[PDB]
Write a protein that binds this ligand. Structure first.
Ligand SMILES: Nc1ncnc2c1ncn2[C@@H]1O[C@H](COP(=O)(O)OP(=O)(O)O)[C@@H](O)[C@H]1O
Ligand SMILES: Nc1ncnc2c1ncn2[C@@H]1O[C@H](COP(=O)(O)OP(=O)(O)O)[C@@H](O)[C@H]1O
Lengths: 300, 300
């Protein structure tokens, strides 16, 4: 058996990267925070980075976060930052909606620079608030993007005096000097990428509603994940109804059906069940109470 | 303003093609049948054709339908058929998931033949039960597919004796004989296609749940429809909850949010509201009862 709990994850002290993803307002952001909070109780320090363009990480903790890692107010070991994509005009010029799917060299480089920073901070574990868009796993092309750049750059190093200062490239670029930045970012990117592909160090937590369109987008994201080689073994099924009002009962009979499907398809998964709450899960005190149900199965 | 009723549509006696689309088990099939049943009351005769691979058109009426138009059991002017796609091995050989998105010449031709049949029957109006897949509007490529064929076919017809029957093509294809079937299938496809692009003659009715993923997939499918120039001005919002049980009330508060969004975006639309019923809408009597609500807004 595999209990309906994220306990197996919280207990892993070798985990360094924990992704949280889910498409279409199923409560991905709420789960990212809840998982982070519950991790602060067990790990030395927890960094919460967000690739999400809505930056709901703020509206959630009701506190403004930037590209600088700040401390989540009610905590001492929990910190959060919001990463900016930083795609360039060049990035764009270099490229139905899969037309903007491949990252540019400038965007990939910027992310590598942020991972560099993050490593310096020496945060114990990192909860990765993924983007609930079409490009959830876009950052997984950064290794191949930088390698292709490092290659086209080295192939150019072979194209190289009396002329002195006037004898350099027009535009001022220093090839052997960029070949360093590029090699250094590529190495940083590759370290983290092979960490991602290590089940002992990196796992992916799916969030979903018990509707069709969500259950679908979920199996579709787990396929993509399994292809890239990123471990996933936990599904959080959010906004569930639990047992004098008839029509509300019918809506629950349907949940039971979708819920049986999930329990069948993902037998090998922890399937965590969260109840729809009556108020928004916004406060820190509310996020706490909500987070408890990630480790202690809810009961009426 | 625009009342929450499909009444405006049932009143258009110039309508010949009425599409029903909706992705993800939101009650598309049920709407297609309901809309036809309501149409049979006002129009001389109604044909219900289905591109939906699931052929839920049977499970809905509890009656087996084929590629031959049969009469729906409890009716006298309502008939249903289920179109088979008929993609060939060639078709496949000639080609993410947008890899099988362009139809083959053999599939396009087959559908043209069916449209040909259907025009012979002289049904007053047709309800078009679309496929709730990623290929909902796939048939709209048939004109361009057949035109490219008729072209490549005509070009070979300029590159073609004392050889007698030995002077034929190998394969036995008769070019001038095919240039006819192809011209005739193109002409049937074009007729029907320029009808689709006529608001007086063709409109598209969308079906959806009040969830995000569906409200999204809906604005997405309307965009594509508008691009192809196919008229759309009605949304059916299915499975809604209506006003001692607290947690169900919360689930309704969320619907209210989604429903307000819909009323705002689709101000120019008829936004029909359907309740979640306690039993499946399967029987003919149950479909009738459901279909009445497409023209008489539901109240507690
Ligand atoms: N189990 C739940 N019960 C009640 N409200 C919830 C629940 N999960 C999420 N919410 C609320 O619904 C919205 C979900 O937003 P969020 O958690 O950010 O999902 P996403 O980040 O995917 O949009 C937020 O207002 C959140 O407070
Ligand atoms: N408003 C409703 N109330 C209760 N049950 C419904 C309603 N709409 C659809 N259903 C049932 O839910 C399922 C919807 O299936 P269907 O109508 O075929 O949608 P789709 O064709 O998109 O799958 C069917 O069992 C149908 O009987």
């Amino acid at each position: 058996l595999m209990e309906p709990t994220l306990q197996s994850i919280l207990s892993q002290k070798t985990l360094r990267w924990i992704f949280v993803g889910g498409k279409g307002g199923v409560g991905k952001t709420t789960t990212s925070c809840s998982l982070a909070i519950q991790l602060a109780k067990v790990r030395k320090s927890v960094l919460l980075i967000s690739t999400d363009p809505a930056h709901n990480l703020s509206d959630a903790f009701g506190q403004k976060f930037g590209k600088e890692a700040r401390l989540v107010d009610g905590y001492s070991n929990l910190s959060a930052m919001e990463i900016d994509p930083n795609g360039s005009i060049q990035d764009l010029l270099a490229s139905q909606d899969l037309a903007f799917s491949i990252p540019g060299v400038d965007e990939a480089m910027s992310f590598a620079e942020v991972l560099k920073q993050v490593k310096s901070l020496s945060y114990e574990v990192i909860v990765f608030d993924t983007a609930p868009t079409g490009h959830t796993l876009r950052f997984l092309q950064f290794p191949t993007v930088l390698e292709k750049a490092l290659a086209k750059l080295s192939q150019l190093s072979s194209q190289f005096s009396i002329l002195g200062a006037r004898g350099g490239l027009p535009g001022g670029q220093n090839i052997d000097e960029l070949l360093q930045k590029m090699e250094s970012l590529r190495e940083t990117i590759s370290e983290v990428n092979t960490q991602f592909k290590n089940p002992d160090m990196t796992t992916f937590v799916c969030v979903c509603i018990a509707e069709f369109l969500s259950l679908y987008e979920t199996e579709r994201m787990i396929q993509e994940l399994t292809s890239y080689g990123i471990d996933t073994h936990a599904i959080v099924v959010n906004q569930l109804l639990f047992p004098g009002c008839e029509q509300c009962n019918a809506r629950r009979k349907m949940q039971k059906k979708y819920l049986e499907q999930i329990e069948e398809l993902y037998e090998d998964f922890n399937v965590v069940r969260m109840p729809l709450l009556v108020e928004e899960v916004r406060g820190k005190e509310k996020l706490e109470k909500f987070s408890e149900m990630l480790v202690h199965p809810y009961v009426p």
